[PDB]
Amino acid sequence: NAQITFVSQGGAYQAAQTVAILDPSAKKLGITINQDSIPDAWPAIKTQVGSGKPIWDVVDTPTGYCLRGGEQGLIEKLDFSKIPNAAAMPEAYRSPYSVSYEFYSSVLAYSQKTFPKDAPNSWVDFWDVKKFPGRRALRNHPIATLEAALMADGVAPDKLYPLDVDRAFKKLEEIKPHITVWWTSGAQSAQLLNDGEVDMEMAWNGRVSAVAKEGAKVSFTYNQGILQSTSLCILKGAPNLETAVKFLNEAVDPVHQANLPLHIDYGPGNPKAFETNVIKPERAAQLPSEPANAAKQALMSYAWWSSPAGEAAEKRWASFMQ
């Protein structure tokens, strides 16, 4: 009869979670997991927790929000001695407030019709409209976008942080007159590649993979990709705290975690998933957080984005868009 409410970003992503993680976890614990979905949980987290009576227990959200939340007292400090699967993960994969749930990438996607050979392969390529002609799109948001701009200006993937925001914006202003559209949704970013409105764009790898698999002649590279993650955390005042903690342990179980990539092109939060032999070699080669793919990417710094510099960067975005 025990119960929690679990919230993620919906779509193929949440359906994939349901098959690999939510349903096997509910069945194993003997609980009911009520689901919700929201594109961006942060403002609702603040309102819910502030009231003292949030309707949500467990939130799957980009890791920076968990950190910001913990730092502002909105998120439960986790007692890891009650979450052995997470405690057995390496320290880099968790915070005092959260545990890595899955890895995704913002990548340079492109048209194989425009580029059957010699595709753009880095942000320096993306910025060079002369050497690589074609319509382009970036996300209407500074996250990952600033990192790409800095890499286009020659910064090494492992020397980005703390971001030189002034420098990133100058670089973005430079490319602006060559950006056909600044997308606001994943589906939009997929449609832009599918109908050939752009020849290249930054996109989430899951969106690119899905449209490719549907038949679109598009692809992407992990080279200079921006490697990101969502994490699970528990809201302060969660009405089902004790049950939520038990669920957290199952949600990062290696075998459950290993099953996620069987249903969607995202890597397991828990790297022990690769030890289960659930993920076949071919499949593993496609995932954002497979060692060789991860080594090609900039690892997003959630310390930087959760800090005041991240907030300030976001405030400058609105100003930038004109």
Residues in contact with a second copy by the rule CB under 8 A: 3, 5, 10-12, 14-15, 18, 34-38, 44, 47-48, 50-56, 71-73, 135, 162-167, 173, 176-181, 185, 187-188, 190-191, 194-197, 210-211, 213-215, 239, 307-309, 316, 319, 322
Give whichever of 214 and 314 is closer to a second copy, judged by the CB atom: 214
Residue 281 CB, nearest distance to a second copy (Å)?
22
Q: Taking the complex as a whole, how short is the minimal distance between the CB of residue 77 and a second copy, in angstroms?
A: 11
Q: How far is the CB of 122 from a second copy (least distance, A)?
A: 22
- The least CB distance from residue 216 to a second copy, in Å, is 8
CB 198 within 8 A of CB 181: yes
Q: Which helix (H) or strand (E) holds 189?
A: helix 186-194
List all residues 6 or more positions away from 282 whose beta carbon is below 8 Å from its beta carbon. none
Q: 191 or 276, CB closer to a second copy?
A: 191
Which CB sits closer to a second copy, 88 or 280? Answer: 280
Cα gap 155→211, rounded to integer Å: 31
**Nearer residue to a second copy within complex by CB, 167 or 296:** 167
Cα(26)–Cα(9) distance, rounded to whole angstroms? 19
Nearer to a second copy, 211 or 284 (CB): 211
Question: Least Å distance between CB 238 and a second copy?
Answer: 11
For the CB of residue 34, give the shortest distance to a second copy in the complex, in Å. 6
Closest listed residue to residue 83, CA positions, set 72, 71, 97: 97
Q: Which amino acid is at 241?
A: L
- Let me know: does 228 contact 234? Beta carbons within 8 Å: no
Q: Is 10 annotated as a binding residue?
A: no
Q: Which tokens hold the place of 99?
A: 């545990």
Is 244 annotated as contributing to ligand binding?
no
The reply, when asked if residue 237 is annotated as ligand binding, is no
Closest by CA to 25, choosing from 236, 244, 229, is: 244
Residue 298 · residue 155 · CB < 8 Å: no
Strands (E), 140-251: 179-183, 200-204, 218-234
Q: What is the DSSP letter of 79?
A: -
Q: Which is nearer to a second copy, 36 or 121 (CB)?
A: 36
Asked whether 128 and 110 are in contact (CB, 8 A), the reply is no
Q: Cite the annotated binding site for (R)-malate by residue number.
A: 186-187, 207
Q: Cite the annotated binding site by residue number.
A: 186-187, 207
